[PDB]
Amino acid sequence: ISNKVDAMVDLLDLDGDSYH
Amino acid sequence: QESLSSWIPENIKKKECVYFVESSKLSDAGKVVCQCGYTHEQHLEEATKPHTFQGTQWDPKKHVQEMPTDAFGDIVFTGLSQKVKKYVRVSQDTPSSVIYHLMTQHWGLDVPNLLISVTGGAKNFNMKPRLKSIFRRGLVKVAQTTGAWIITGGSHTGVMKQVGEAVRDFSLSSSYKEGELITIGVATWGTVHRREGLIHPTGSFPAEYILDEDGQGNLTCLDSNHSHFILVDDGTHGQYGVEIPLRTRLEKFISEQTKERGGVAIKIPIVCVVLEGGPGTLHTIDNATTNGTPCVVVEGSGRVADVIAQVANLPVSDITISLIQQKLSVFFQEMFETFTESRIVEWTKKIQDIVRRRQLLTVFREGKDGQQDVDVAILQALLKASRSQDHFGHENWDHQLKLAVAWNRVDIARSEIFMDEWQWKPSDLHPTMTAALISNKPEFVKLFLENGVQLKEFVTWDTLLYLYENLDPSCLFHSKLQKVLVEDPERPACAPAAPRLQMHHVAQVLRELLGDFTQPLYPRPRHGHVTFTMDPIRDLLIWAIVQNRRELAGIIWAQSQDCIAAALACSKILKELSKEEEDTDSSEEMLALAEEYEHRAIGVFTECYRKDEERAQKLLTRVSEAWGKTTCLQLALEAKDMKFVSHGGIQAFLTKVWWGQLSVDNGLWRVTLCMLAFPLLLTGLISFREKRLQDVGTPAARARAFFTAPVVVFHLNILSYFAFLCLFAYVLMVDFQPVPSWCECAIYLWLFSLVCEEMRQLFYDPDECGLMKKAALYFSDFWNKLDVGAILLFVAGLTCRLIPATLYPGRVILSLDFILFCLRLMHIFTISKTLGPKIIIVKRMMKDVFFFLFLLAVWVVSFGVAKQAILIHNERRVDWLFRGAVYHSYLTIFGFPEWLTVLLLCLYLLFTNILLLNLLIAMFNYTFQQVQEHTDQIWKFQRHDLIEEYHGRPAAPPPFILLSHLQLFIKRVVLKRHKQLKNKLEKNEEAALLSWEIYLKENYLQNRQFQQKQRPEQKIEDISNKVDAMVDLLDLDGDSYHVNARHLLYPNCPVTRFPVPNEKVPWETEFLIYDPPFYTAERKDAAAMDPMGDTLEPLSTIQYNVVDGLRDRRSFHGPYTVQAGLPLNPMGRTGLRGRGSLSCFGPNHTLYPMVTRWRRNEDGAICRKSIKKMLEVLVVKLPLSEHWALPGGSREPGEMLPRKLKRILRQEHWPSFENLLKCGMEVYKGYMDDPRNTDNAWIETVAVSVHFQDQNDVELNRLNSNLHACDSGASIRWQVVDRRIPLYANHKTLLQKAAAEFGAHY
Amino acid sequence: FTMDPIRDLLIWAIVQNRRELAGIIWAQSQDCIAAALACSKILKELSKEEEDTDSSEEMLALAEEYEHRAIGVFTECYRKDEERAQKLL
């Protein structure tokens, strides 16, 4: 359950000048 | 005390209406009232005289006068309490310095740390029970810790009654605790019921006031719980509200003008708070918030609270006067119809001017899921207000944090106070560390540690003394320390009776708690910057462990120096303390803590054993310098540290001592066989370790090293004792004579040798200890008791054998002696593996079998006397019948006549053969059930002292121990343990050993906390915190006017103006109720200013928007409209008709010059902000302005208008030169917002800015020399520029407008 | 009105083995240490004559809980001020 809810909180937390 | 009673009629005044101006509306049975009607037919306490003018509508400025006050003093309520209460009647206008000097000096109230001013509804107040709960715990809990000053209105009604009750019961329930939550009440002198008894012309040092809740018409009576009383008088009688400006004015002067401890100033923080109110409440909040005190309102509480809390986050322009009465009439639904439009516009104006200043207000929100405290609200209402009030203040940074300690808010203090912008040094956290420690707050000391406070630098000597001065008085150790310190006899001469607390006192109680063997820890002085002890963290550990503070001690153990001594000492102290506790809940926790510390000691030592064993053995035999010159092992012995001594490696150390110089594995039978033959040891018969003795065979050294081992001396003493018994038995059996034999005298010689060995067993003193205590620890031993009983019986028997007339007595006495010696040999079986555990149970069951056997004796005595009385003739023989019946009773106990014989034998069979056997069965079941299996650990703990006693003993069997006694007795005639059980190591060695130890501790701690992370309760807690963060994350998915003009309280002129909302400001919008008073100043009819303050006459003829000669009566912005021959404000409406204190109508033109320069560092380069730079302005402070402001003058003269600001300030002749140099740059011109604006006479300005770019010698040199500044002013000085710097807010607008011209910061 | 109302309601709610109702109305009681012991005495004197194998166990455990409540109040009042707390017995 803890691994499930940590995957859940990870998924919910998921939401130049060119010179010489 | 009489200085007060003289001082009050000198100092304070009180108001007096002097003339009868008879009121038109005659009062309710007070028809003779002259518009105040206090105590006469008139409003007079003197002759109601004509006074040369009977002025109709007698002016309160002109009629009412001041008089010296006599109504002061003390008070008591008749029977309702027993304590006394101070009270003072005070004038309407009084300097707050006077009242502060009174309350400090002549009342004896020290300076506070917090000022809560609570306000609410007085006569008509109703509350839900949930609101009632916060007053009982939230207000009292936050008042009682910080040492607050609850200031409120003094009344017996409503909310003030709730505060009065909720502070009273705390004082009763405190159970004679020190200190009382001081409470000061302020009410008006007019609306007091029975105040005629209070006026005593002399000093009323006693007084009596009886409250009566019957005669309350217009008036109201006092409350009986407030501890000081202040009665503002006004001269009026029934007025409500003459106490608000005095309370608000006094609160500020107390908060921000009295504490200046190391610096400029430091302000005592201050909070106003409301519950539910009406028209008195809004005026109080509005008058308070202009003075800088924050205000927290509570949601879900009452009428005014809800209508403020609904309009909290709204924009300021969004308030409609319709919306006000709409939200008003629903919450005021009892008296909603009692509202008129003028009351609606007044309340709309007040709510507008309050919710403008969003910094100084907070809502409690009534979160109602935890319903946490007032404290979480009050802290944020401090912090938001403190930043806005000042940015350079440092008192709030250190004064605030301390307060945040006392309510246990670590998330707030971490997030808000410890973000940035403090620039603290770490040692500056030292005093606020200390109060975090005494108040037992582990979280804040953990946060200070993670922020970088060093314990080793922190604990000074005097700091430790102060720590012990403030022990928790509930604990047992405080009572024991008090019982010592009161019984301290050597403190004769001092100013007081209770002398002091010195460190040798707590050292003396610690020595008696710890045991006799240690030395005193702290020395007594035989008589700086920072005196340090030998080891600081030891002392703090002792302090935190005597008071049963668990989680605090668990932190500061982790920084300890030498840990294995420390955990065992803290186990010993707790076990010695938990016996004398006598409270059924303290003893269990105080025991389990000691068990946890035993676990910590085992956990460190089992690491250090596994890393390197032979070094880890050196850790036990070390003598610790810290804990009073003892070792670790003896400390573990005295504490009955059962689980510690049964560890494997320490038992291996004990065995390695036991087998001595030779190896440990060669068994016992081979030991007996090499004991049998002398050169068998010289042969390859036995083992050895330390192979220089095993390989290189030096047989003299090998024989000496063989005899040095204590197993050898043990077996030799056993053999000699055995032969002693056998030859003693032979001389006792047949070889006994009245003349002494020779086999007898040899045996008496061997027993003399035994008694001299027991003598040196008693007299040996390795370290100095109590000699009587040495005898006590001797005689506490079981086998010592048996040995001394045997020797005293022996010398008594030898005395009896020296009597030839008692030979058969004396001989059999020496028999009984023999029996004692037999039990001595049972001592041998303690050393076995398998028998000692059984011997323990015998030593157990002796204790109750004794008290059983006494009962058996009384039973058999009763039986014997009964049988002797029933079955004999009447006889009194000496030893015939009594001894015959005693032998018959011994035959019975060791193993018509028909009915009586059957009755006697059946009584014997039912009694002595049955029930006491069942007592024995039950008692020994209860005994043997209890022993369980602990017995092996009891034996392993019992193993040590035998090895000790044989290690100390000399090597000879006791016929030859005299050879040992002679050399030791002659060495102690002329002028120290062995170095295998206690040795003082090299200092250089001990440093390396302790560093190795303190390395290994941190390796223990990680495994400890990591496996503590695997308990399931920890996992459930982590899952709950995860899902609460998850539900929080998922739950996550105005019109600019002249607002300083509309603001009330026209300065230096006690008048008012009309309430004007944000709607009816401009001249375009019609306001049908707009009726401002035609207000003029007293100096509006005066000198060279225009006399048109009373321009209803045709005297108003000067030029409008044109220069009427020297009066350039023309705006820089544009042409003002004229109505009824007077100009109107082009900006809108202000609420006051007339000229006011201004010179003339329209604009009154003035020039505001500002000087600017750069702020350099110590080098001379520009100091830098985050992006911009630092700027300096030169400002003035007048002696009666209490404010810094710009040196700007009225432009009534042409060029000397800066000299009209600064003739006295700048110079006289060089001032005209700098005025020639004053050709600078202009930033802003036109109409200016100001509180001195009516609808007619406003202020227009021109603003010039002159600058110093170079900060060396140039234009600035002329400003330096051309300065005669000290003319008629208090102070002028240069000043840093920032957005928080003190000034008029009107001038702050000028600086924030002109700071863009040079790019300074903000 | 009677001499003390909440006493009577406590008696009524405790003779009928209503647990969670009695636990509420104990909290408003007047003199609590007498009340918890009286309600323990009534339950122990009643649970003997019950003769139902399921009612007697709950009717006994309730009395044990009320003994716990009396101890819990008295150990507070002892710790605050001992010599006044002796006057309570």
Ligand SMILES: Nc1ncnc2c1ncn2[C@@H]1O[C@H](COP(=O)(O)OP(=O)(O)OC[C@H]2O[C@@H](O)[C@H](O)[C@@H]2O)[C@@H](O)[C@H]1O
């Ligand atoms: N100082 C007073 N003492 C007792 N009663 C009062 C007082 N002032 C007003 N009252 C009565 O209270 C009634 C209205 O009470 P509310 O509107 O609930 O309270 P409010 O008038 O807002 O008074 C706020 C009160 O709090 C105090 O800090 C302050 O002295 C102010 O008077 C009125 O009928 C009035 O007679």
Ligand SMILES: Nc1ncnc2c1ncn2[C@@H]1O[C@H](COP(=O)(O)OP(=O)(O)OC[C@H]2O[C@@H](O)[C@H](O)[C@@H]2O)[C@@H](O)[C@H]1O
């Ligand atoms: N824009 C403003 N912002 C704040 N306060 C103001 C402003 N304009 C005037 N005041 C206040 O109004 C009060 C009366 O105004 P003036 O006396 O006309 O102002 P000024 O002449 O600059 O000050 C005279 C000073 O001499 C002292 O006797 C007196 O204490 C006052 O500080 C003063 O105390 C001043 O502090």
Ligand SMILES: [Ca+2]
């Ligand atoms: Ca002995």
